[PDB]
């Protein structure tokens with residue numbers, strides 16, 4: 001099927017968030033893991049970059065234990081940057 | 086400043102549509118011109134591909150003279166494809 | 171000055187009636203004496219409740235002290251509202267505006283929600299039954315929508331006890347599926363104990379789980395079961411035993427003989443029974459305040475039939491109601507005061523946590539201040555995973571004659587020795603099972619290797 | 621009223637009850653062995669001497685949600701018929717992967733409710749939720765509909781599910797042309813010959 | 825477009841066809857020059873079709 | 876001398892800084908260290924000098 005970078009983004013944030021939910025309270029540790037899982041599930045134009053890189057970074061620096069919900073709600077609108085390199 | 090391909094898409098369709106509105110009855114002819122302008126205004130990850138390619142093709146193949154509104158309303162949700170290639 | 175007051179004790183309620191009698195004895199005065207008429211019934215039965223209520227009514231009681239259930243509560247509220255007869259209850263607070271009802275029990279919602287906010291719970295599971303009503307459920311759902319909470323609402327009351335074994339196993343299986351640990355138990359103490367036993371049986375009381383018991387009876391039940399389980403458990407306490415009042419009362423309570431007062435010989439007391447005692451206090455002080463204000467509430471004639479249509483209420487009732495609602499006294503539940511509607515105000519709910527040594531109060535909850543906190547509070551062998559590669563890890567020629575870390579030789583072996591030497595730990599060299607460095611399987615999405 | 625009918629020596633009683641009064645009816649009819657037949661909502665449990673004319677909506681609703689394949693939606697309820705349906709769909713949400721927003725519209729007084737619905741649907745704009753299930757009496761249904769049209773959320777892209785047997789009993793002409801999908805349940809088929817004849821007699 | 829020649833008795837779908845034909849051109853911006861009654865009618869129909 | 880801010884400096888570390896800042900999504904202002912040292916710990920005062 002055809003790829004949609006936008007659909008890729010929305011799916012990315014959703015899957016990352018849904019992933020981090022099982023890791024509640026350890027949330028700040030597993031951001032990159034769940035980002036990997038989300039990159040696998042939602043696909044990526046560049047395997048290194050991932051589905052949404054900017055959201056990944058935002059989450060990584062913002063997310064604190066149990067602070068997940070507010071963090072995701074803040075970071076999901078963030079610009080993903082260039083999904084090329 | 087990050088581009089965020091999704092916002093790039095919404096902007097792309099918006100600028101294409103707003104441009105094509107200026108040409109009445111010639112809508113099917115100027116699709117590529119207005120797409121050029123939209124790629125210019127909204128920027129592009131790949132200058133060749135443009136902001137959203139799938140929407141461009143969709144419009145080119147669908148749009149008939151005076152059929153603009155319905156055609157665009159049909160084509161704006163379509164997957165853009167690979168933005169880097 | 172004999173004051174006739176009706177009362178309703180559900181069959182099997184002992185310590186409540188015991189504390190009721192103790193209240194009758196302690197708050198008795200030479201000025202006036204309460205003359206209780208006790209009537210035992212099936213509290214879940216609406217018909218029984220109606221009969222008992224009209225029985226007390228025709229007897230011409232000036233007030234009624236009793237209990238109700240989710241089924242029978244509307245009968246009590248409607249009848250007391252119609253006949254203007256005051257009703258005093260330890261049972262759960264009604265959600266709404268109900269006249270002529272004095273609810274001794276404090277509203278637990280605020281304490282609970284503030285507790286959730288305190289532990290910073292983004293997502294949790296809420297186990298409830300329909301006994302005390304779904305009011306709390308509505309509360310936590312609306313607060314969940316407002317604060318963006320993901321809450322799992324599960325009704326544990328509709329599962330039949332005869333067929334419930336694998337039901338709860340499947341329950342906690344589905345609950346373990348999502349990796350959700352945090353759990354709130356809002357239930358009657360019996361159902362709580364059942365769920366607890368199912369938890370220890372299924373081994374869900376291990377580390378990583380956090381249970382919140384919502385009730386005023388946190389220390390009234392047995393906490394010894396999950397105490398050593400290793401899971402954190404938190405709850406609410408309406409009775410502070412460190413208070414001098416409660417301590418002396420407890421001395422008198424524990425010195426009492428069990429034969430005369432059933433279940434009255436104990437170190438503690440169920441919060442319902444305490445609420446009953448304090449209710450006795452409230453009634454005594456109410457009628458005392460009535461006598462000091464020089465208002466005579468004495469009945470001229472018999473009340474007649476309660477069902478008689480059109481029902482006519484007595485005038486005195488409103489006066490007795492105001493008398494009860496205006497009462498402010500000190501008791502086992504802390505400061506006791508009521509608003510215009512009869513609900514509790516200015517109460518204090520001690521917030522407590524179960525530790526290894528036992529239960530302890532970590533704070534208190536106020537209607538205004540919300541949550542306020544009270545006083546703030548070898549070496550294991552390190553497993554080293556490694557893979558065989560030259561010259562990183564290799565088998566010695568004589569290795570069959572050796573054991574453990576002496577079996578392997580290589581760069582990584584020596585490096586391991588150095589790292590363990592500097593970090594000061596005992597290390598066990600082991601070869602990885604699958605024999606891979608590390609990878610993500612494209613199918614199972616599971617990491618393999620070291 | 622019940623004891624009044626009883627002393628009159630009636631052989632049966634036909635009536636209605638409320639979430640408050642239902643226990644009185646069930647307990648009294650069970651105790652006095654007087655048969656009670658009602659159009660009102662089905663009691664949850666095993667109650668003798670009560671014949672409930674109203675069908676159970678739970679299964680139909682759940683099957684419909686499964687049919688439209690709704691992963692996440694908003695559920696608007698009131699305390700009038702009870703939280704039984706809410707409890708049901710919550711339990712099924714726990715079983716499935718459903719994300720459900722449960723909001724109580726019943727405790728809101730009709731006199732002062734203007735901005736209550738604006739703020740409600742504002743909070744509904746927070747989550748971006750375009751799918752909504754209304755479990756309510758026809759009156760609250762109509763009010764909520766009017767409020768939906770007022771803020772213009774009845775346009776295309778929105779999907780509403782009205783839970784009741786009265787889908788055609790309330791006014792649907794309001795949101796009919798809005799372009800939003802609306803689904804519901806009907807217990808009376810006017811296409812049936814019996815109902816057609818009854819309607820011919822009824823309209824005269 | 826003349827909205828004045830439309831009879832009130834038969835006018836329901838007339839406005840639907842009007843704004844459908846207006847959707848053809850994709851026209852959003854609209855100027856209403858009308859009597860308060862006709863203004864109110866056209867407005868109500870606008871709310872009905874959700875434009 | 877004719878430029879200002881981050882445009883004043885050019886180099887490997889400048890480009891790397893630009894890349895890192897682009898990746899982490901923050902605005903960065905390049906500044907030269909005061910003491911002009913990389914880093915050190917004085918064995919007496921135990922004060923760190925440098926970047």
Ligand SMILES: *[C@@H]1O[C@H](CO)[C@@H](O)[C@H](O)[C@H]1NC(C)=O
Pocket residue numbers: 515516536537538
């Ligand atoms: C008593 O309750 C009222 C009602 O909320 C409150 O305003 C007041 O501050 C309370 N007093 C104390 C000492 O908590």
